[PDB]
């Protein structure tokens with residue numbers, strides 16, 4: 022009702038009624054139950070992912086700040102890790118969505134005194150965040166199916 | 168009560184429809200009037216105790232002094248519609264009304280609650296025994312109905328178990344459960360310990376060790392109940408009493424302190440989110456908080472100090488709440504290994520068992536069984552092994568003076584126990600304390616709390632070290648703990664696959680270094696190339712760093728092989744790398760994680776199914792008991808309840824050996840000999856008397 | 862349970878439930894032990910009618 | 911599949927006698943009955 026009434030205020034509010042198939046069609050209802058069955062687990066893994074990304078943000082802010090320049094310009098750099106909140110947002114936004122982890126986005130560590138530390142940083146981020154945690158989420162979904 | 172105890176003894180080893188039980192029923196029927204008078208004496212006062220506490224009675228209570236007139240008592244009791252005229256008159260007579268006909272009902276109700284409790288309980292036990300062994304006698308149902316209130320009142324304390332007796336038959340045993348015992352068994356921490364124990368045995372246990380593991384669990388539970396009772400709460404003396412109060416307060420609130428430390432860590436990290444680095448002070452850089460409130464700069468310091476304090480209190484609470492159980496378990500297993508195995512007398516572990524090798528330090532200490540109840544384990548080991556190995560050698564191993572045994576047997580000395588710290592200084596057993604501290608420092612939970620300490624302390628060196636305490640949710644939240652267990656379950660497999668991935672990447676590195684070097688130029692410049700595969704170590708690092716993280720394998724990063732004499736070889740290289748490394752191996756890792764999820768789920772399901780389908784004690788499945796309606800529920804709640812075996816063990820320990828009955832003495836002797844054949848194994852009372860009962 | 866307290870003393874509590882005499886039955890069962898008038902006040906009954 | 915194969919092998923050994931084929935349920939009528947049957951009566955090492 023409320024969404025229908027708001028649809029007269031703005032016609033795009035009628036897009037919400039398209040979600041009605043979630044309950045109208047029993048197959049879609051079962052499929053979404055295969056998600057909602059382990060919802061508490063999914064939210065807990067999302068929170069744990071947030072915490073591990075926070076830890077990586079802390080390490081980056083302390084040590085690897087010089088690698089977070091996201092400006093091709095030379096005289097006005099765009100540093101994404103001069104503030105801890107900005108660095109954490111940068112991580113949670115681009116590092117998780119990047120296929121190869123944060124190392125895909127940040128600068129190349131070749132020929133630097135911290136090269137090995139940074140490659141360990143990138144590999145561990147890729148394995149814990151991109152591989153293991155997303156694998157946990159997908160496994161929770163598949164296990165709910167089973 | 169003594170007469171009833173004699174009757175119950177007459178019912179020892181009594182089969183269903185036994186002649187002695189039938190004679191007992193005939194005797195009760197012959198004295199039906201007097202038995203009814205006795206049961207009425209009990210039920211009137213049981214009913215009165217609750218009636219005087221009812222709102223309906225308190226409505227009639229009007230005197231500000233808390234008393235009631237006899238006429239008001241009369242009109243209150245007939246309003247309850249539970250007594251008759253003569254019964255109300257008898258209650259009036261029993262009430263010690265003064266010259267003003269004023270009744271002190273509070274003391275009137277409690278006058279007979281205590282004196283009549285034991286006899287009421289034994290009457291309940293007698294009637295229950297007769298009912299369950301003579302189930303087809305109509306004359307006994309009348310007594311059972313007339314004692315309905317007695318049986319109802321004593322139902323929570325009437326503990327019954329079944330044992331395989333000396334007569335090679337199943338016997339049913341009735342005993343008393345105390346209010347304290349039941350209340351302590353219903354505590355949430357004890358429930359959690361029971362759940363963990365059930366999970367452990369049902370999941371990864373064998374049937375031969377099951378009853379022994381259960382009895383060990385019962386013993387640990389008894390010790391935990393003692394610790395809970397101790398820590399419970401209703402100039403040297405003042406300092407000692409305040410110290411024990413403080414320690415008990417910490418022990419009781421250990422989990423609240425843990426939660427508080429976690430909350431403080433969250434607050435500290437939230438504050439830390441506002442940090443900012445600038446070249447200007449608030450070629451070195453400067454770290455500072457960037458805010459307009461001006462308050463979280465001191466708030467961070469306050470929270471850090473509070474967090475360190477709370478973590479310290481958590482460690483103290485732990486070694487005042489759990490370390491006693493750890494030491495108890497270790498001392499108990501050591502004592503049983505000494506006595507029933509001769510571990511350090513006969514086998515002498517072969518230096519590959521660090522536990523056994525560390526336990527050597529506590530053998531000769533004067534205070535070895537500090538937490539274990541058996542203070543005479545050394546004496547028992549001596550009496551068992553001194554003849555065959557040497558009394559003096561055993562005494563030297565266990566640090567015993569063979570001379571003092573006689574005088575201790577002769578008489579008891581009462582010296583002066585001076586309450587001085589100076590006199591207490593050399594009372595300390597240094598070797599025992601070293602052993603205990605080794606056991607504590609080798610414990611996982613204590614080590615975790617000590618690491619929490621170290622990180623908190625380092626947090627004052629640098630405030631970002633408080634980020635590590637955010638990992639505490641891994642153990643604080645059971646859901647996150649299970650989720651991380653779904654990773655750690657196959658950790659060895661995961662590490663092996665990572666190593667195998669390293670090896671295959673090394674092979675690809677070897678092939679690339681030998682043949683495809685020209686394709687590894689990572690410089691857009693033309694005059695100073697950046698070759699990543701002119702050195703084997705550089706090439707291997709390049710692979711393990713960019714090839715694995717690339718979605719399409721190494722071919723995404725290296726140069727295009729179009730129009731080259733090695734084009735086909737290189738495309739085979741790239742495709743095989745993509746399939747073996749990116750697809751198959753990462754798929755193996757994710758499959759290991761998903762399989763750990765499934766394994767944990769089926770473990771939980773199997774534990775629940777085993778509990779709901781077989782009796783934990785006898786092993787007979789629910790199918791047999793469900794022949795009678797609610798048969799399995801009754802068998803698991805009344806006949807073979809494991810809580811009742813726990814209660815029976817505590818009842819035996821607390822009861823005097825001279826007062827043990829025959830069945831109790833049988834079980835007690837067998838328990839002290841560590842023989843568990845009294846547990847019904849595959850047999851039950853219902854099964855043994857199938858034909859009489861049916 | 863806390864929301865169901867509003868319907869106890871209503872004149873029309875068993876509107877859909879078939880048993881229109883549940884209040885009478887509860888009175889006959891518990892009035893002796895808890896108080897007939899107190900039960901009637903809880904369930905909104907007139908003991909006179 | 912590999913995991914359930916291992917579990918099935920362990921379960922079969924722990925539930926039926928490798929020689930006679932009578933399950934553990936029958937022998938467990940006597941206490942420790944299956945353990946005694948598989949260690950003394952029908953031990954395969956003893957047939958070897």
Ligand SMILES: Nc1ncnc2c1ncn2[C@@H]1O[C@H](COP(=O)(O)OP(=O)(O)OP(=O)(O)O)[C@@H](O)[C@H]1O
Nearest residue numbers: 358778779781782783784785803804807808809810
């Ligand atoms: N010998 C046994 N003693 C007790 N329970 C047994 C036994 N054998 C099997 N069970 C099963 O153990 C299950 C767990 O006990 P139950 O759930 O009744 O206990 P509870 O104290 O009410 O609470 P909880 O659900 O926390 O265990 C019961 O459903 C029962 O079927």
Ligand SMILES: Nc1ncnc2c1ncn2[C@@H]1O[C@H](COP(=O)(O)OP(=O)(O)OP(=O)(O)O)[C@@H](O)[C@H]1O
Nearest residue numbers: 923924926927928929930945948949952953954955
């Ligand atoms: N006929 C049988 N002979 C021997 N074992 C049998 C037989 N039938 C079933 N089993 C089972 O085989 C299992 C494997 O044997 P068991 O583990 O006892 O042998 P082991 O020599 O002590 O060591 P291991 O664990 O390496 O096998 C036993 O637990 C037993 O229940």
Ligand SMILES: [Ca+2]
Nearest residue numbers: 824825826827
């Ligand atoms: Ca005696």
Ligand SMILES: [Zn+2]
Nearest residue numbers: 782784785807
């Ligand atoms: Zn049973």
Ligand SMILES: [Zn+2]
Nearest residue numbers: 927929930952
């Ligand atoms: Zn066999």
